[PDB]
Design an enzyme around this catalytic site. Structure first.
Site, PDB file in Angstrom:
ATOM      1  N   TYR A  15       0.837  -1.194   0.000  1.00 53.87           N
ATOM      2  CA  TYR A  15       0.000   0.000   0.000  1.00 53.87           C
ATOM      3  C   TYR A  15       0.876   1.249   0.000  1.00 53.87           C
ATOM      4  O   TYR A  15       0.650   2.163  -0.790  1.00 53.87           O
ATOM      5  CB  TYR A  15      -0.914  -0.005   1.235  1.00 53.87           C
ATOM      6  CG  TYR A  15      -1.621   1.301   1.485  1.00 53.87           C
ATOM      7  CD1 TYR A  15      -2.846   1.596   0.881  1.00 53.87           C
ATOM      8  CD2 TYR A  15      -1.035   2.271   2.290  1.00 53.87           C
ATOM      9  CE1 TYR A  15      -3.463   2.843   1.086  1.00 53.87           C
ATOM     10  CE2 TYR A  15      -1.622   3.494   2.491  1.00 53.87           C
ATOM     11  CZ  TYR A  15      -2.826   3.782   1.896  1.00 53.87           C
ATOM     12  OH  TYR A  15      -3.363   5.020   2.117  1.00 53.87           O
ATOM     13  N   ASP A  39      -9.578   9.621   7.656  1.00 56.39           N
ATOM     14  CA  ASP A  39      -8.287  10.277   7.563  1.00 56.39           C
ATOM     15  C   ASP A  39      -8.460  11.778   7.434  1.00 56.39           C
ATOM     16  O   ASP A  39      -8.960  12.265   6.421  1.00 56.39           O
ATOM     17  CB  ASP A  39      -7.540   9.725   6.348  1.00 56.39           C
ATOM     18  CG  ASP A  39      -6.171  10.337   6.175  1.00 56.39           C
ATOM     19  OD1 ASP A  39      -5.726  11.087   7.069  1.00 56.39           O
ATOM     20  OD2 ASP A  39      -5.533  10.052   5.141  1.00 56.39           O
ATOM     21  N   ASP A  98       4.229  12.792   9.615  1.00 60.79           N
ATOM     22  CA  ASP A  98       4.431  11.455  10.175  1.00 60.79           C
ATOM     23  C   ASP A  98       3.063  10.900  10.499  1.00 60.79           C
ATOM     24  O   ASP A  98       2.285  11.530  11.206  1.00 60.79           O
ATOM     25  CB  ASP A  98       5.280  11.527  11.430  1.00 60.79           C
ATOM     26  CG  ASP A  98       6.673  12.035  11.142  1.00 60.79           C
ATOM     27  OD1 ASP A  98       7.371  11.389  10.333  1.00 60.79           O
ATOM     28  OD2 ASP A  98       7.061  13.075  11.713  1.00 60.79           O
ATOM     29  N   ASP A 101      -1.136   4.298  10.175  1.00 58.07           N
ATOM     30  CA  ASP A 101      -2.427   3.816   9.690  1.00 58.07           C
ATOM     31  C   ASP A 101      -2.738   2.500  10.369  1.00 58.07           C
ATOM     32  O   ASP A 101      -1.859   1.660  10.542  1.00 58.07           O
ATOM     33  CB  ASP A 101      -2.422   3.541   8.176  1.00 58.07           C
ATOM     34  CG  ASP A 101      -2.528   4.797   7.331  1.00 58.07           C
ATOM     35  OD1 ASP A 101      -2.955   5.851   7.843  1.00 58.07           O
ATOM     36  OD2 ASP A 101      -2.199   4.709   6.129  1.00 58.07           O
TER      37      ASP A 101
HETATM   38  C1  EQU Z   1      -3.120  14.580   1.384  1.00 62.59           C
HETATM   39  C2  EQU Z   1      -1.676  14.578   2.037  1.00 62.59           C
HETATM   40  C3  EQU Z   1      -0.766  13.624   1.174  1.00 62.59           C
HETATM   41  C4  EQU Z   1      -1.026  12.080   1.436  1.00 62.59           C
HETATM   42  C5  EQU Z   1      -1.571  11.676   2.836  1.00 62.59           C
HETATM   43  C6  EQU Z   1      -1.843  12.706   3.895  1.00 62.59           C
HETATM   44  C7  EQU Z   1      -2.361  12.319   5.231  1.00 62.59           C
HETATM   45  C8  EQU Z   1      -2.625  10.923   5.564  1.00 62.59           C
HETATM   46  C9  EQU Z   1      -2.372   9.889   4.549  1.00 62.59           C
HETATM   47  C10 EQU Z   1      -2.645   8.498   4.895  1.00 62.59           C
HETATM   48  C11 EQU Z   1      -2.400   7.489   3.908  1.00 62.59           C
HETATM   49  O1  EQU Z   1      -2.656   6.257   4.244  1.00 62.59           O
HETATM   50  C12 EQU Z   1      -1.886   7.826   2.580  1.00 62.59           C
HETATM   51  C13 EQU Z   1      -1.610   9.170   2.210  1.00 62.59           C
HETATM   52  C14 EQU Z   1      -1.831  10.254   3.146  1.00 62.59           C
HETATM   53  C15 EQU Z   1      -1.575  14.189   3.598  1.00 62.59           C
HETATM   54  C16 EQU Z   1      -2.525  15.264   4.227  1.00 62.59           C
HETATM   55  C17 EQU Z   1      -1.848  16.562   3.650  1.00 62.59           C
HETATM   56  C18 EQU Z   1      -1.321  16.057   2.245  1.00 62.59           C
HETATM   57  O2  EQU Z   1      -0.720  16.734   1.446  1.00 62.59           O
END
Ligand code: EQU
Ligand code: EQU
Lengths: 125, 125
Positions: A15, A39, A98, A101
């Site tokens: 992933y 998220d 940082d 998940d």
């Molecule tokens: C969208 C994002 C890029 C990817 C990303 C973010 C936050 C949590 C995540 C969790 C994931 O499992 C995969 C990608 C992201 C960021 C929030 C601010 C930003 O630029």
């Protein structure tokens, strides 16, 4: 729950690979057809591959890189958690986030639920 | 939920300090009087400071060291997750375990629930 602990680590690590290259369609396919994504965790849930795809496209198409920052922690009930860092460019300003998940996989080895833990205290310029 | 995101990082980082020195009574005090602990996540929950104390004593009194392996990810609803490594001695055999704990704090800044993610795929000799 079908995935064994080793299968969880593999799946979750893949992933992160997908988010790194930005293969949106491949990412959507890892999720169950009716999966939910929270998220950042705390926000309202996103449901279904259509919405999930929109979410990922809105966040990946631009610029964004990601990688595991530690091994994947996996349980025996198809559940897992992993730490990783995301590096993106915020309107010119280089940034990193940082994140951790927590994913629950279904009997077909697909992601049924994903919850991302982070807030601005995890942002860094 | 009372703790702000910064307070969550501080609290969770202190917890790891306590597990490192092995101050069992100090650890029990960080938990709500009626908190639940699921460790490893998947197992039946442990409830109440008495049971929690037994759990921690059974696992710490011996030998055990611990430390954050990444920053603490905190949300805005009093929830947090952190990655860390535990190094112990299994009946003579030196071992390490990579874990991620997800904690929910209550309005008094105490841990209401803790879930530890890990399995033997996270063990290492
Ligand atoms: C969208 C994002 C890029 C990817 C990303 C973010 C936050 C949590 C995540 C969790 C994931 O499992 C995969 C990608 C992201 C960021 C929030 C601010 C930003 O630029
Ligand atoms: C008990 C133990 C030492 C401490 C510990 C373990 C697993 C999850 C933990 C989660 C914590 O939040 C704090 C301490 C531990 C190990 C399981 C095997 C072992 O030796």
């Amino acid at each position: 729950n079908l995935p064994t602990a080793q299968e969880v680590q593999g799946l979750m690590a893949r992933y992160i690979e997908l988010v790194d290259v930005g293969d949106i369609e491949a990412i959507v396919q890892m999720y169950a057809d009716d999966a939910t994504v929270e998220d950042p965790f705390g926000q309202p849930p996103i449901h279904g591959r259509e919405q999930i795809a929109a979410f990922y496209r809105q966040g990946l198409g631009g610029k964004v890189r990601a990688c595991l920052t530690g091994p994947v922690r996996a349980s025996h009930n198809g559940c897992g958690a992993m730490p990783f860092r995301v590096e993106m460019v915020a309107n010119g300003q280089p940034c990193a986030l940082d994140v951790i998940d927590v994913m629950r996989f279904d009997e077909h080895g697909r992601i049924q639920t994903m919850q991302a833990y982070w807030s601005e205290v995890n942002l860094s310029v």
